With several copies, the nearest count.
Chain A
Amino acid sequence: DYKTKVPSPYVKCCGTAECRTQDKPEYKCAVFTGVYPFMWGGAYCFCD
């Protein structure tokens, strides 16, 4: 039997991205534009 892992996604705001590849079986990275989260205390950051 197997098990998955989803280690803690990354946000940085008003600055875009780039993820890097690495050796491990079935690694898939993605990149999504136009996200505006809203965490517990208030709105997270404002570079909307």
Chain B
Amino acid sequence: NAYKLTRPYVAYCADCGMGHSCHSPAMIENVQADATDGTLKIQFASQIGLTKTDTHDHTKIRYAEGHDIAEAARSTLKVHSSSECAVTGTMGHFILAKCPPGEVISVSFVDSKNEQRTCRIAYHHEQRLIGRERFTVRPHHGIELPCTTYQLTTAETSEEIDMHMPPDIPDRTILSQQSGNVKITVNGRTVKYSCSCPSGTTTTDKTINSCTVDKCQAYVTSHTKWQFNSPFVPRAEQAERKGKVHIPFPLINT
């Protein structure tokens, strides 16, 4: 209801699934698990639930590519810890799961043209042993005890995360020569750039003369929507401007 101001984004990751250092639209941080029934809420860089630009939906996820917005189907959303483990209801930036022990947690799905997007980070947990025994699945007679678990509602009790406006992005698909002079090839968004061999030129494909492609530098701005306050992208102009939006899934005792 407030997500009409933000976007999916891409960032760095630890591994790619092969043993290298890709950039991919699904990376993980903050896998905090402060409940006692043994479920974990992991935070996810892309967005789910909402379809393209604005309406509510339960089937299409929203991810990012290059400069634009794509979509994929929710029915191929997979996680792994050391075996498979199922998902139990999701929305927003967040997913939350019930998984057997291990040393990694991986989140993946299928993008547009039938490829895969993986990420694997490191995390460690066990079963926390409520009672005086060690089981795995709940049986069908015995005592009831106090435990603490997650709700599956939407309205929230005042805890939130920060929000920010995105920085500039450079590109070299714009640049080309013309056997001689230099030309910026815009595809229809505002670009202010530099060469030292530079002013605000909105929606106008210009050509400035007499240089090589060794000396001219471009930047594209994205002044409409907002983006998370993440430590893997550069910041802003040096002032401290921000905003706010809320995080779902509070806690209760059962």
Q: What sequence of 0s and 1s flags, for each residue 1-45 of chain A, a beta carbon within 8 Å of any chain B beta carbon?
A: 000001111111000000000000000000000000101111111
Tell me the number of A-to-B contacts counted with CB atoms below 8 Å: 42
The residue in chain A whose Cβ has the minimal distance to the Cβ of B196 is A46
Please report whether the interface of chain A is mostly helix, strand, loop or mixed according to DSSP: loop
Contact A10 B235 (CB under 8 A): yes
User: Given that A39-B170, A41-B171 are contacting pairs, would A7 and B162 also be in contact in the complex, using a CB cutoff of 8 Å?
Assistant: yes
Given that A10-B238, A11-B235 are known contacts, is A41 also in contact with B230, CB under 8 Å in the complex? no
Assuming the contacts A40-B10, A40-B23, A46-B217, asked whether A9 and B170 have C-beta atoms less than 8 A apart, the reply is no
Question: For residues 125 through 183 of chain B, which have their beta carbon under 8 Å from a beta carbon of chain A?
Answer: 162, 164, 169-172
- B10, B231, B238: the one contacting A6 at CB < 8 Å is B231
Q: A42-B170, A42-B171, A43-B170 are in contact. Are A11 and B234 (CB under 8 A)?
A: yes
- Choose one: B171, B229, B238; the contact of A7 (CB below 8 Å): B229
Inter-subunit contact B164/A8 (CB<8 Å): yes
Q: How many residues of B contact A (CB 8 A)?
A: 17
Q: Which residues of B contact A46 (CB under 8 A)?
A: 217
Interface size class of A (residues with CB under 8 A): 10 to 19
What 0/1 readout, one digit per residue, does chain B (220-254) give for beta carbons within 8 Å of chain A? 00000000011101111010000000000000000
Q: Which of B164, B171, B172, B234 contacts A9 (CB 8 A)?
A: B234
- For B233, the chain A residues whose CB sits under 8 A away are 8
Would B231 and A9 count as touching, CB distance under 8 A? yes
| Residue in chain A with minimal CB distance to B215 | A46
| A9→B235 contact, CB < 8 A | yes
List the A side residues contacting B230 at CB < 8 Å.
Answer: 8
CB distance from B162 to the nearest CB of A (A): 7
**Known pairs A9-B231, A11-B235, A42-B172. 17 more at Cβ < 8 A?**
A7-B229, A8-B229, A8-B230, A8-B234, A8-B236, A9-B235, A10-B236, A11-B234, A37-B234, A39-B169, A39-B170, A41-B169, A41-B171, A41-B172, A42-B170, A43-B170, A46-B217
Nearest first, the 6 A-B pairs at minimum CB distance are: A8-B235, A6-B231, A42-B172, A10-B235, A41-B171, A11-B234
Interchain residue pairs with CB less than 8 A apart (30): A7-B162, A8-B164, A8-B229, A8-B231, A8-B235, A8-B236, A9-B231, A9-B234, A9-B235, A10-B234, A10-B235, A10-B236, A10-B238, A11-B235, A12-B238, A37-B234, A39-B169, A39-B170, A39-B234, A40-B10, A40-B23, A40-B169, A41-B171, A42-B170, A42-B172, A43-B170, A44-B234, A45-B170, A45-B217, A46-B217
